Amino acid sequence: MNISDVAKITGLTSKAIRFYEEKGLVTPPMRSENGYRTYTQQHLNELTLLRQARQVGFNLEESGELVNLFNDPQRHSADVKRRTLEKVAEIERHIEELQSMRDQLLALANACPGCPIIENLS
C-alpha cells in the first residue's frame, strides 16, 4: 500500500505517519523501484497500535516502547501490564482534575441568574 491508503485505513494523517517514521518509532516503509513508500500489514499493525496508544493517554516515548514490546517475541505480558496500570493511575488523576474544574464552573453557574461568573473570574 502507499501512504494514502495506510492513512485512510488507520485514521492517521500522512503528516503523522511520516512523523512516526522520522522519530524511528515504527519500522521504516520500503521504497519501490520508483523510490516511493510502500507498507505491509506489519506497518499497519505498528501504526494502529501507535494510534490507539496515543488515544488512551500514552505519550510518544511510551507509545514507542509499546511498539517495541509488540515486536518482541519474548515480551513479558507483565511488563505491558505494569505500564498499563500506571497509565490508568494518570487517567484517574486527569479525571479528578476535570471534575474539580467542572464543580467550580457549576458553582459559578449556580450563583448566577438570567453576573457572579464574570465577576469572580476577574
Task: Summarize the annotated binding site as residue ranges.
Answer: 112, 115
Alpha-carbon separation of residue 85 from 70, 73, 79 (angstroms): 17, 22, 10
Residue (30 or 121) nearer to its own copies, CB: 121
Residue positions forming the annotated binding site for Cu(+) = 112, 115
Identify any residues that bridge with 16 across adjacent strands, giving them in sequence order.
none
H/E segment holding residue 30: strand 30-31
For residue 90, give the C-alpha cell. 494518570
30 binds, among Au ion, its own copies, none (CB under 5 to 8 A by kind): none
- Binder of its own copies out of 32, 36, 57, 59 (CB under 8 A): 57
Backbone angles phi, psi at 57, to 5 degrees: 110, -15
Query: Is residue 1 within the footprint of its own copies (CB under 8 A)?
Result: no
The answer to the question of residue 27 lying near its own copies (CB under 8 A) is no
77 binds Au ion per the rule CB under 5 A: yes
Q: Please report, as residue ranges, which positions from 66 to 85 form the binding site for its own copies (by CB under 8 A).
A: 66, 69-70, 72-78, 80-81, 84-85
**Which of 55-62's residues contact partners 24+ apart within 8 Å by CB, and which partners?**
56/87, 56/91, 57/87, 57/90, 57/91, 57/94, 58/87, 60/23, 60/25, 62/87
CA distance 91 to 57: 7
Give residues in contact with Au ion (CB under 5 A).
77, 80-81, 112, 115, 117
Give residues in contact with its own copies (CB under 8 A).
45-46, 48-49, 52-53, 55-57, 66, 69-70, 72-78, 80-81, 84-85, 87-88, 91-92, 94-95, 98-99, 101-102, 104-106, 108-109, 112-118, 121-122
